[PDB]
Amino acid sequence: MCMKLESDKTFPIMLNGQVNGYACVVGGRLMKPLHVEGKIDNEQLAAVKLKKASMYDLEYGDVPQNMKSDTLQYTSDKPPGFYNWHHGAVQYENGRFTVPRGVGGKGDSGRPILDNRGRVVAIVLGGANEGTRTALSVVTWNQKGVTIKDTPEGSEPW
Amino acid sequence: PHKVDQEFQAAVSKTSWNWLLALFGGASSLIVVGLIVLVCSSMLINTR
Secondary structure (H helix, E strand, C coil): CHHHHHCEEEEEEEECCCEEEEEEECEEEEEEEEECEEEEEEEEECCCCCCCCCCCEECCCCCCCCCHCCCCCEECCCCCCCCECCCCEECCHCCCEEECEEEHHHHHCCEEEEECCCCCEEEEEEEECCCCCCEEEEEEEECCCCCEEEEECCCCCC | CCCCCHHHHHHHHHHHHHHHHHHHHHHHHHHHHHHHHHHHCCCCHHHH
């Protein structure tokens, strides 16, 4: 499902020995986290100059020629729950993105949460295991469409 | 000899106090503007 859908668009970030994060091509924007350190792969999308955000913990830029393939529409139209994912299915019950136990580790701090129609909805950043079920600190888009952050208590980046 | 002694608060002419205080108040006004826009940025990051 989503594993094939986000393929060749979710470019991983190297820790110089392994992968420590993922980078997304959203609206011509090379979105990668700031806490994820290292060098991004490829050369078409690696030699660009990125601009820090430091309030949303992302970094953005532009692609020179890949606009024909930089096709990941972001959408804030979001019914509450039942969304696909790289690993499984995520739930947006009670206005909060939720995941079952265990899944999610280092190397998985930058991959998108897709829609039912292949539209990027969320870009995961970290998580916390508390309450009834664990929750995620994640950058999304609100009802008005402005970039917003949703973060639990004690949500260290996994 | 002079009947009085010079004072720094007096020997500087009133128009020169006006010019120096005008430049200093301009600098302080731009600092106040910077703190105002920093407060506005804090309001926006509280809003998000």
